């Protein structure tokens, strides 16, 4: 992305812009905590989808694959 | 950029107080990621550590059985 600062053709309006952009920065960061909710579920779902592969890899496969050869011996 | 030449402050104080909660959320994201990138790395490792020795004796006694 590339935002232009063009259009600026020259203290209440200083403090109004310190307000207005931060009435718009609680804003972007309320939107960010709702995106970061998506990151929290993406991380908890990533531990879940690693643990689900450790589950499948150990429980039925690897422990079955071993004791099915010991039972053959 | 080489430049060579209180009401709406109450609205900016109250919204710097709210942007401070929203920076608490974006710094709690940064702490949630700090812990959870350690937690994904502990989960993607702990079956390679603790079970990563017990499953190696479990296998060496199969190699010992043949």
């Amino acid at each position: 992305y590339a935002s232009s600062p063009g259009g600026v053709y020259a203290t209440e309006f200083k403090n109004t812009r310190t307000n207005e952009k931060v009435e718009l920065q609680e804003l972007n960061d309320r939107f960010a905590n709702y995106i970061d909710k998506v990151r929290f579920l993406e991380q908890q779902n990533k531990i879940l989808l690693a643990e689900l592969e450790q589950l499948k890899g150990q429980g039925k496969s690897r422990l079955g694959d071993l004791y099915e050869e010991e039972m053959r011996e | 950029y080489a430049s060579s030449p209180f009401k709406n402050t109450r609205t900016n104080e109250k919204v710097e107080l709210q942007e401070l909660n929203d920076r608490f959320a974006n710094y709690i994201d940064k702490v949630r990621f700090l812990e959870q990138q350690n937690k994904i790395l502990l989960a993607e490792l702990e079956q390679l550590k603790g079970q990563g020795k017990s499953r190696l004796g479990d296998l060496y006694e199969e190699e010992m059985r043949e």
Binding site: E26, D29, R30, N33 | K14, L17, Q18, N21, D22, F24, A25
Partner: peptide, 19 residues
């Protein structure tokens, strides 16, 4: 952030009555 603060609104009314 889902705490658009009530304790700030109760802090305003107190500091406003003190003033």
């Amino acid at each position: 952030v889902s705490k658009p603060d009530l304790t700030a609104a109760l802090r305003d009314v107190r500091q406003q009555y003190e003033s």
